[PDB]
Amino acid sequence: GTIARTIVLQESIGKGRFGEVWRGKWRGEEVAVKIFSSREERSWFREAEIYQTVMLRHENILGFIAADNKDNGTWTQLWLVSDYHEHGSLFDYLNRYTVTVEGMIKLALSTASGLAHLHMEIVGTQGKPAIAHRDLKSKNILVKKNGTCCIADLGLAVRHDSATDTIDIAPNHRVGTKRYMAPEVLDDSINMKHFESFKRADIYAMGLVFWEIARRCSIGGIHEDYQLPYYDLVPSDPSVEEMRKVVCEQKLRPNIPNRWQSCEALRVMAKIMRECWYANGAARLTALRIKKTLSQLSQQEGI
Template identity: 40%
Template sequence: MPPPTPWLTSSGGKARDEGVNYYRRSTSQASCSARRSLKTNLCKWCDSTAPACEEKVCYSNCNLNSYCEDPYEICVAIWRQDNESIRISTLCHNPQRPIENLMVPNYNTSRCVMSHQPSEDGIIYICGCVDEQECNDKLIFENHTNGYSMLQSKEVIPVAAISLLPPLLVAVMITVIFYLCRTQKRRKRAKAWAGKQGQPPALLEQGKATEREEKLSVLMDESPAGTSAGRRPAELLPIELDEMVGKGQFAEVWRAKLSRSHSGQYETVAVKIFPCEEYSSWKNESQIFTDSSLRHDSVLQFLTAEDRGAGPRREYWLITAYHSRGNLKDYLSRHVLSWMDLQKMAGSLVSGVAHLHSDYTACGRPKIPIAHRDIKSTNVLVKNEQECVLCDFGIAIRLDPSLTVDDFANSGQASMSCQPSLEEPFAATPTSRG
């Protein structure tokens, strides 16, 4: 008969109880170890990876993970950007200790919110998180701006600049060419207009530039006796006086015909005629008119100045554009303006005064300001239903900075002596027409 089995005996029963207790203790220890492992964080753990970004969030792109050894360790992600390259490091770390001389900020959260850290080795962001598995995989940047988008913007800016440079250069070249063409065209028109207004057609066809300049110039001699024949235009304009439209104390204003060709075509102009003894008045007004910077749409158009005849019958002419509607005073006495027409007419008048007083022309060229000193309705001509022009610069003065106070005072006294007498009924008419 075989011997009895040990655990069936009393001593065997005791051994069985000890084995059961050992199994229970081992199971309990394993359970405790498992419970401790559940309290640690499961984190992404890679030394260096390239991030993958989608819109406003980036991912570490790390395929490895690990449980942290200690329950107080957290998941950490470090973003490094240097020389236009980005690398991500993920690991477990004790937040009470520095990592690469940096402390992990704001780690008591389940979201890995990146925080910028000052560094001399490029751009560094760092974040920490707990209580969620692999929470350092999803990298969130504040203000919806991440390093990847910053890198992309740095790459896009030079590419965009290089792409836009050729169109910008072409646009600048087109603008410069257009400006030069417009300027050249204006100069040609100005020369053609000057020749057309100041010369007979026969002289234009012959192309006598010297005679044209002499014809458009104004004789600026100190006295009538000092005006030599050599200073006169080579040929006077072919003007035929038609009708006197006004007479004042110092001058008469005539409507005249300026012949344009041998076929009998003509242009209507206004001629303000000064007698020989009023040479100084003619000279003062012609000096104002011959200033090229005076030209403006709201200033009476000046054609030329001439002296005609000899001896006591010598006369001095100012030839200007003719406006059949007359001066503003007479026009308003015959017409009722609408509010819109009144605004436009007043605007043109203000524009002319502003041009006189300005230190620069409309093109930006410096000019000497001019004070009209006699603006009134009889010295404003109606150009059309919505425009006016200033005329009668008999007492106007150029505000030249080189002049002294005495010069201004003497100029004013000399000019005032040329004003028409208020006792004569036609005193204002020539100034308004001329």
């Protein structure tokens, strides 16, 4: 179509299970283009559908430009064009850098604000349904030039129909990254007909991401090396059984260093983490409550 024909792909930057991400140039501006083959039309269409949800746009959700198709003369490529963020993922950013207390709060508050918007139902003619991500992780959050985050990779999301309390694609199977699966998803006790259960599972994953950020917060030159949650308990690319044994059976969570109690911002972050990690999803904080707590902390810090 008219957009793809004017885009020049400059570099393949990431390959995943669902499409390949390229850096391209559109109207002289850098854009990200996720490309799918003809046999991945269902994943491409579903991701285009989620990104076109009414009132979805928000500073902390990846800005979607358009879906399109490009025929090179041999085969067709299915495209999803979005904003490009040079820093890449929060995982890449946290591996490359340490952050200040201000930096950590900006990353955590922006992630929570994005998740609170995703989770929020807006009633009305131009209403927005509540959406649960189902695959939140540091590799799926991007970092903008201004040091704030935006949630991306919304292709596995589910949307709620509040009038009937049903889910648009009626999920019947586990999806997502095993390391970040909530206890109820690992032991298959989650009620997949209950939309609020998917929101609660996203909060557990956000707690893990907050732990990744807090390790990189450098105060007086003191910080931890970058690690994925559960690096100390499971192998790389862990199985559901490996994760379940640790999270559900042994009931372990990522370690919270004692020294995080010595700094008010780290104390607030550690308390949020614990309150995201409860085995009972109904006891977890909501994204809106986390946004409120961190906004109160950001104001206090003078960010």
